[PDB]
Symmetry: none
Amino acid sequence: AECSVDIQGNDQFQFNTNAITVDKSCKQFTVNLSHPGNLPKNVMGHNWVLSTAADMQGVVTDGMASGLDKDYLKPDDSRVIAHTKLIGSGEKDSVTFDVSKLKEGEQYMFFCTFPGASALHKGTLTLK
Amino acid sequence: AECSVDIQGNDQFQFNTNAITVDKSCKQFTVNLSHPGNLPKNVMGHNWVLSTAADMQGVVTDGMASGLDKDYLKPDDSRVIAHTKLIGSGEKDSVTFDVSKLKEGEQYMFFCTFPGASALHKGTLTLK
Amino acid sequence: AECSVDIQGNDQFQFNTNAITVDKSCKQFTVNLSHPGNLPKNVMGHNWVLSTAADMQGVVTDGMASGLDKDYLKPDDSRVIAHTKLIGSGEKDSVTFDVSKLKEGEQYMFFCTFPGASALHKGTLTLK
Amino acid sequence: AECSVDIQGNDQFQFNTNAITVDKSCKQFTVNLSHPGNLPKNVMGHNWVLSTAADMQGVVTDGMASGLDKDYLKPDDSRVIAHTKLIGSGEKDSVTFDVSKLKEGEQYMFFCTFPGASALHKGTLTLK
Ligand SMILES: [Cu+2]
Ligand SMILES: [Cu+2]
Ligand SMILES: [Cu+2]
Ligand SMILES: [Cu+2]
Ligand SMILES: [Cu+2]
Ligand SMILES: [Cu+2]
Ligand SMILES: [Cu+2]
Ligand SMILES: [Cu+2]
């Protein structure tokens, strides 16, 4: 199977996908995030953050509060299964995590914690 | 004789059968439940749940209140003879139970405890 | 004095308050219920229902027994001073009632009659 | 508010959008569908069909079975809230429908019922 996915954040609080599938024969999974927009990190920051569907809103709430100096992530946040850093115009970043950190049947959400994203700057991640 | 049945729930709150017969020579019996629908488990979850006719309403009622994190079954409900887990679009689960649990000629109902089901989201099971 | 209040029900069995004040100089009082969550009313319904603290338990117990097709309220329940309809995600409802129906020294509770509430899906209303 | 949207179906079983919002003050709403592609209708037809999320699979399935002569829609399908006709390369079709057919608390999908298109040949439509 394939074990990585390419994801674009644009200038309008948007990923170019809202659903990721992780094949369970994969040992590791890799998310390749890039920012094809023109806006700096401070006005249009994007990160890819992975948590349980239950933990999502708590990670985002505390994240937005942490501010830009913390990459919009409450420090030591145990709920974050994996995450890229925050990136702005031009930049890119890749995160790799162990598929054994996941479970079949459990609901996971990927999302961005930069402030201003609607309740739509998110998507599902599924172990199949 | 056969001691298994394949059963499907889809996006219109429907099992694709209303009657199961279990041959008395069976020692175990297996139900293979699948969800060919498009809707995820939290808006159109399906399970397959077995009880006496008398106990059905109470199982369905208490399951309602238990919520999605309990798979819409009240914990430690002794009236549930056997059941699958709750599944959503594209998922599958199988349950196998001992036919010693079922008494000849008695009235057994199978049903789904996810909310929003019609009173007819049910069916009979019987030892033949 | 203000004579209205806005209240939100979310995807986790919760109002965004448990304390309503109705000033005695109000001729009418208005509750604006909105559902910012994402689940339909069949798995995450919210209503705002008002009775005496005395009547609460009986309105709730009978309402869940009345099922989704009755908005989880017993028909012709005289214990209900005022109520919204049951709403799900993306829905809103408003209810306005005469403040006269309220008398000083009486305790009033507002509550939701949907199954699932962790006995904290309630709150006080008092004539100040 | 504007009360129309322009949508293109290409030579790749692909719409050029996945989300449509209909302003609630719109009395009618128009979808202007065009096929800027090269492939003819019987190998790459496109339509725009609207239903509840729940009804979608049945509309797609029953329409598949109905064939090209019927525009890949089962005749007299009451689950179809509105639709264009099937169009091929160089064609265009517009459909105008009553917004009162929509309700604020419902999840609507739009999609194409021509065969071969993936589970991605779809989109959400929401009242706003
Ligand atoms: Cu592989
Ligand atoms: Cu972002
Ligand atoms: Cu046998
Ligand atoms: Cu079901
Ligand atoms: Cu006043
Ligand atoms: Cu509620
Ligand atoms: Cu207008
Ligand atoms: Cu198409």
